[PDB]
């Protein structure tokens, strides 16, 4: 054997074990989710409070690309940052040449091709993050989830991290119970609940909730963080549902 | 054709005493026959008890002072906060100026 010792090597199955090993690093990370709604998307993430010494609200994990795209990820946090930095360069060159802000599907492939490129050579390591991202463009709302292999799809709801199965099960219920659609303000509240429910798989340390959102009506198509009253309202909603 | 230089006028003056030294300069800034500013300082405190002025083409003057001020900053970092002596500052400025020997800073410099 030894097929797993080098990246970009096919096993006799037809698998790249190094990418599957990177997935294990993603599975190890904290829970992050994405919820598509009527006229936008909502992102949320679990921030494990390792210590009392962590400053609240000042270790921001959700990142913005351009002015209309939000990105969140689980796994090796630095790898995620590297991917977003690239995303920002890709979005900047698109706007520079084509004037219009980069569409979400276009942006999705830019990250997709870049992550896929890191499975082509043994001189690079695959990304140790699954990245949930999306936003609002001319064609409306889009939510995506990108994996270490470079594989991505459009989603109604997306989840990754240690509590992905708990979050997925909860996401599947929303899709079934709301066929006509979920509103932006609703999706924010649901996102809080799902992070709290997904926290049961990581319940040693208590956590800090962080939510962001793009919405054509609520945020005017721009990415904004959910803060203050709207955040506390979503936290209270989630606290009420676990009990 | 594009002329990269200009003349911002003004004048400067340096005199040395026994235990002191002065560097003076008028605060007028001009182009051609127009006044740009009646108060635009061009004599600067660069730290380590060194005062500097690069009079002539103001863009090159400001760029040079900026670089020398930055040179003083890194002299501290690289040499354990040692004070940059006036003779060492002079020699450092020679290299800044001569570095652009074939596209000069159009300035009369005094420290």
């Amino acid at each position: 054997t030894g097929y797993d010792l080098s990246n970009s090597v096919f096993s006799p199955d037809g698998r790249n074990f190094q990418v599957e090993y990177a997935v294990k690093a993603v599975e190890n990370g904290t829970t992050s989710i994405g919820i598509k709604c009527n006229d936008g998307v909502v992102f949320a993430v679990e921030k494990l409070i390792t210590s009392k010494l962590l400053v609240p609200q000042k270790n921001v994990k959700i990142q913005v690309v351009d002015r209309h795209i939000g990105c969140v990820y689980s796994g090796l946090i630095p790898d995620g940052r590297h991917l977003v930095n690239r995303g920002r360069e890709e979005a900047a060159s698109f706007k520079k040449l084509y004037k219009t802000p980069i569409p979400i599907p276009a942006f999705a492939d830019r990250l997709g091709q870049y992550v896929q490129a890191h499975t082509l050579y043994n001189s690079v390591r695959p990304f140790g993050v699954s990245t949930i991202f999306g936003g609002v463009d001319k064609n409306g709302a889009h939510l995506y989830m990108l994996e270490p292999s470079g594989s991505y799809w459009g989603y109604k709801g997306a989840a990754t991290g240690k509590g992905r199965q708990s979050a997925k099960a909860e996401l599947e219920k929303l899709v079934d119970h709301h066929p006509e659609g979920l509103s932006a303000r609703e999706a924010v509240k649901q996102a809080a609940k799902i992070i709290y429910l997904a926290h049961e798989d990581n319940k040693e340390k208590d956590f800090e909730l962080e939510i962001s959102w793009c919405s054509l009506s609520e945020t005017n198509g721009l990415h904004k963080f959910v803060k203050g009253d709207l955040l506390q309202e979503a936290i209270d909603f989630a606290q009420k549902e676990i009990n | 054709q594009f002329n990269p230089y200009g003349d911002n006028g003004g004048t400067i003056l340096g005199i040395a005493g026994e235990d002191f030294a002065v560097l003076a300069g008028d605060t007028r800034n001009i182009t051609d026959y127009s006044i740009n500013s009646r108060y635009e300082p061009k004599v600067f405190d660069c730290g380590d008890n060194i005062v500097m002025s690069a009079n002539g083409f103001a863009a090159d003057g400001d760029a040079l002072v900026k670089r020398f001020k930055n040179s003083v900053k890194w002299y501290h970092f690289d040499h354990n906060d040692k004070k940059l002596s006036i003779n060492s500052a002079a020699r450092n400025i020679q290299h800044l100026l001569y570095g652009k020997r074939f596209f000069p800073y159009y300035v009369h410099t005094i420290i």
């Binding site: 797993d4 010792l5 080098s6 990246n7 190094q18 090993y21 990177a22 997935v23 294990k24 690093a25 993603v26 599975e27 190890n28 210590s51 009392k52 010494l53 962590l54 400053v55 000042k58 270790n59 090796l76 946090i77 630095p78 790898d79 940052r81 590297h82 930095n85 890191h118 043994n122 001189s123 690079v124 390591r125 695959p126 140790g128 | 900026k66 930055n70 900053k73 970092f77």
Partner: protein, 231 residues
């Protein structure tokens, strides 16, 4: 085991052993403590010597008039990273006439350390850093790890037996955070914190290294007889 030959290789459980071995170099390094209030931020560093004839390895480095760090691990790597910070702080000043935010400083270090963990040939940085600073949003303290992970904190400690100081600061959190407009008391809290990581040795005059930055205080380092006040 078979997956620690270089940084470009993942283990079957999804671990980067070279990054973890670099992390191990920090644990071997001498203890250093960071803590802040709302007005000031303080670094306290236990310096280490080769023997009684040798000098004590300088742990604290200045980056700008408003920012600097303390190191634990490979000192040459700290020099590279501190030099990079100095340039980024300086780029911000010359180009934008703007003091570099301590948060951006951390983001820049994270991204620089990350590139070394994903490429063949290179190696991770073998040092941990505690960056303090005072900017437009008040006092700050960062903890840099060579995995790339940067973390903003009220207080922390890295190095050998850093768990003693880190537990102390976790208890003292409510006290030292409100030491506003008082440098000497914030330092005392830091000197008392680093004392919890001491074994057999005690804080002497050429052993202790303290730095401070704040509202009306440029980043300045205290060594030798200047720290005798706090022993």
């Amino acid at each position: 085991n078979n997956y620690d030959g270089d940084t470009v290789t993942f283990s079957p459980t999804g671990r980067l052993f070279q990054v973890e071995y670099a992390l191990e170099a920090i644990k071997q390094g001498s203890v250093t403590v960071g803590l802040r209030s709302n007005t000031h931020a303080v670094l306290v560093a236990l310096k280490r010597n080769a023997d009684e004839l040798s000098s004590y390895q300088k742990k604290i480095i200045k980056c700008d008039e408003h920012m600097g760090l303390s190191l634990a691990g490979l000192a040459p790597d700290a020099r590279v990273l501190s030099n990079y910070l100095r340039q980024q702080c300086n780029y911000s000043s010359l180009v934008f006439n703007r003091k570099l935010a301590v948060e951006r400083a951390g983001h820049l270090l994270c991204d620089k350390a990350q590139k070394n963990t994903q490429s063949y040939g290179g190696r991770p940085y073998g040092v941990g850093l505690l960056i303090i600073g005072y900017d437009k949003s008040g006092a700050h303290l960062l903890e840099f790890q060579p995995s790339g992970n940067v973390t903003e904190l009220y207080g922390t400690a890295i190095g050998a037996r850093s768990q003693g100081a880190k537990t102390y600061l976790e208890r003292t959190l409510d006290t030292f955070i409100k030491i506003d407009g008082n440098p000497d008391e914030l330092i005392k809290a830091g000197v008392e914190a680093i004392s919890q990581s001491l074994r057999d040795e005690s804080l002497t005059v050429d052993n202790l290294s303290i730095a401070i930055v704040g509202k009306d205080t440029p980043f300045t380092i205290y060594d030798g007889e200047a720290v005798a006040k706090y022993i």
